[PDB]
Design a protein around this motif. Structure first.
Motif, short mmCIF file in Angstrom:
data_model
loop_
_atom_site.label_atom_id
_atom_site.label_comp_id
_atom_site.label_asym_id
_atom_site.label_seq_id
_atom_site.Cartn_x
_atom_site.Cartn_y
_atom_site.Cartn_z
N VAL A 290 0.86 -1.17 0.00
CA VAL A 290 0.00 0.00 0.00
C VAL A 290 0.89 1.23 0.00
N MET A 291 0.58 2.19 -0.85
CA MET A 291 1.45 3.34 -1.07
C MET A 291 0.90 4.53 -0.30
N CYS A 292 0.72 4.37 1.00
CA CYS A 292 0.30 5.47 1.85
C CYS A 292 1.44 6.45 2.00
N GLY A 293 1.10 7.71 2.22
CA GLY A 293 2.12 8.74 2.30
C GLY A 293 2.95 8.81 1.04
N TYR B 186 3.92 0.14 2.45
CA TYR B 186 3.72 -0.66 3.65
C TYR B 186 3.14 -2.00 3.22
N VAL B 187 2.78 -2.82 4.19
CA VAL B 187 2.25 -4.14 3.92
C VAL B 187 0.88 -4.24 4.56
N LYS B 188 -0.14 -4.40 3.74
CA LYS B 188 -1.50 -4.54 4.23
C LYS B 188 -1.67 -5.90 4.88
N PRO B 189 -2.04 -5.98 6.15
CA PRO B 189 -2.17 -7.29 6.80
C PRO B 189 -3.34 -8.12 6.30
N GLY B 190 -4.53 -7.55 6.16
CA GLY B 190 -5.67 -8.34 5.73
C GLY B 190 -6.87 -7.44 5.49
#
Lengths: 133, 133
Positions: free
Chosen positions: A1-4, A8-12
């Protein structure tokens, strides 16, 4: 996920914007409803049941759940018909309305709010407060 | 009583030689049977009763026993008819035979042996051993 500006890694859990959100949510909703009805019917004492046909239903439901190993189309059919008679539903994505028998519910032959609370607790990891039902 | 050659005082109970023994014994027999049925029906939990008409019967029976003060012919009539349908009796003097519903008896809507034992205990001052029933 390209937040900011970093990855990051989306858990679920779902990502609300994909190609099929509302429909998969509808499916998950019906799943929880059916699970609650099953828990309600199985967690009730047998001797207290008046009608012979309903015990037959509960007895053979325990059968088809744990004793059996593969599908049994007629049981599924008649149970689905039973649900369609005692628990009619209207489902838009995660937003439901239920028109249900009241005395059956009181006796414990369909699901009331308490069953939904228990199911959500052990299968969704949330506590559904009763001020919203 | 002129036993031996002297006069004693009979405390109570029948003298099985008078003008009307067998008939009075029949009356007393029916009395005990009805008392046992009444105790059976009143000593059973209400919520466990399935049929609405039977809860109506038990409820209004408690009424007509303690709350009311004088007779109520229709209640007596329909209760007598109820007994004639689910207790059918054959009475010679103190010697009875009963043809009764079996599932009602199991549930506790008519009288089984245990009720007779309890009734005889507190209203006849004897212990009816179950080797003779």
């Amino acid at each position: 996920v390209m937040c900011g500006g970093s990855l990051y890694v989306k858990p679920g859990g779902t990502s609300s914007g994909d190609a099929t959100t509302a429909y998969a949510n509808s499916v998950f909703n019906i799943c929880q409803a059916v699970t609650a009805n099953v828990n309600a019917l199985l967690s009730t004492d047998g001797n207290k049941i008046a009608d012979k046909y309903v015990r037959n239903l509960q007895h053979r439901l325990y059968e088809c759940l744990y004793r059996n190993r593969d599908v049994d189309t007629d049981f599924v059919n008649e149970f689905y018909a039973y649900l369609r008679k005692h628990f009619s539903m209207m489902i838009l994505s995660d937003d439901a309305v239920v028109c249900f028998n009241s005395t059956y519910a009181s006796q414990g032959l369909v699901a009331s709010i308490k069953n939904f609370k228990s199911v959500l607790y052990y299968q969704n990891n949330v506590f559904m407060s009763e001020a919203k039902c």
